[model samples]
Target: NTVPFTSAPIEVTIGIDQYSFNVKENQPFHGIKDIPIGHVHVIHFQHADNSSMRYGYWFDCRMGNFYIQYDPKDGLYKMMEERDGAKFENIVHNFKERQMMVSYPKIDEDDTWYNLTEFVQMDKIRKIVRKDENQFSYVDSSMTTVQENELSSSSSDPAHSLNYTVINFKSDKSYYLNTVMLQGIFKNSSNYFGELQFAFLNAMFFGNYGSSLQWHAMIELICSEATVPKHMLDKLDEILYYQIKTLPEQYSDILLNERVWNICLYSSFQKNSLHNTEKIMENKYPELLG
Candidate 1:
């Protein structure tokens, strides 16, 4: 038989500091909404055969209890509400399987996935634009030949929406392009160590782990090429190094993944005709191909 509202204590650390707390099975905690406050932040229960399970909860005194559990059955962690009872229903779970879905734009890498060096040969160009808010002028510009080219290659969401365009000059006969929206990407964000470690397992095996690792490293490399402040670059270096180092043991694929990401970034800079950056990148990393 299982007892509800029973209590236990667990130790946890955030950054460099450690704390201990008592957790109750179904205790109501008066914490902020959607934020967990409990005796233990997480509970890892093990079976005799070395298998384990984990779950945790957030409580609100008046709002009742919220619980999240990990099921090894599906590759997803799930949340449950007290009112839902035994129903494992979640709009977030179902909606996320649809909403979080992404389709990566493909460039004709010409077999660059197996050979990163061929990325240097692609012909691409980029135009950075800032547009007026007026609908008429914007519409007119959007109708121009170059704008039509831009639209055919990428999203046609208008310059009022995004800041940059990259046109892949595959040939005079055919053009492929990718539209980049840059407004939200420049923010400073850091994951707590616990969060990083928790997500690392998911990242290692499935979901956005591969892309996230590659993109983070690519950002560092690109920023270095742009000659960001040394202190900033130093932090970026550490960030990429930390991400790579924290991959699961003996994961040999991350190195190739890093190289591919570098090729992606290099392809963008080179094709966009960002001359100075292209020059610096080629000179500084000739060893990339070798």
Candidate 2:
């Protein structure tokens, strides 16, 4: 007994002022086909009492729905822990439990809803390529040397391929990802707010609420980091302050989540890494005051 569509009035503004309509209804796809290029990972739902905390968007880069890019880190262990945390674990378990059904041939349907939990962290640097088109579903995480699933690059078959090469820890990663792909193409792609909201809502479902209050703050705080600009919106730091102010009451763990504090701290980090932004004037640019 749910109304399929929302009836709310739309608000139009700069930067992320659009929505994208679903091109089709629930299309069917196979288990392997449903997973992205990375290794299958998992996202654990929290304890039963804390249901609201268990939502997030696990990206399927293939579908452009869930993003799997690694976050920045100062060292190797830090990055590994992030990659292998609860979120990735849930995705792996979800996919493994399904017996890799998403990739099998189906009688009907073009797409299917994959639980955000069914994602994987394929080590792109060590990936082994497959020449046989039928073996694309094979993935190896055994810590053994690289393994290849049969796949082909021919245009006639056009394999729906994905890769996991661009590690975030690498210095060469570009802003186009944060700006154009993450901010622009995603949040502001459509002209309809309904469409956009639905897309964003999809991510909200898998967000790890109980264990990830800080992560939650980080995600919501970064809305200002949308692929495009939000001119009239308040500055990033101010907006973050307002958002964090409200979370403690709504989420019980808000006070305990260290990442939440770190992110709020980052809102002011304003460590502008933009290539084009340069402090031309020594006198004009306010020096970091001690």
The global C-alpha lDDT for each of the candidates, from Candidate 1 onward, is 0.29, 0.26
User: Tens digit of lDDT per residue, candidate 2, span 116-173?
Assistant: 1112222221132223322112221111111011222322211222122121212344
TM-score of each: 0.29, 0.23
Q: How many backbone clashes does candidate 1 have?
A: 4
TM-score of 2: 0.23
- Candidate 1: regions farther than 4 A off: 1-65, 68-77, 83-202, 205-226, 229-231, 249-251, 254-258, 261-290
Among residues 3 or more apart in sequence or in different chains, the pairs in candidate 1 whose N, CA or C atoms overlap within 3 Å are 22-39, 23-39, 124-271, 125-271
Q: The CA-based lDDT of model 2 is what?
A: 0.26
| Model 1 lDDT tens row, 1-290 | 01021111212111100112332333332221222222212222222232222222211223334443434575322333456634323422344333222222233453212121111110110112223221111111112233344556664454433222222323233322111211122233222122222222223322223323434333433433432334433343343344444344453454335454454354444333233333444443343441
Worst 10 residues of 1 by lDDT: 117-126
In angstroms, the error of model 1 at 17 is 17
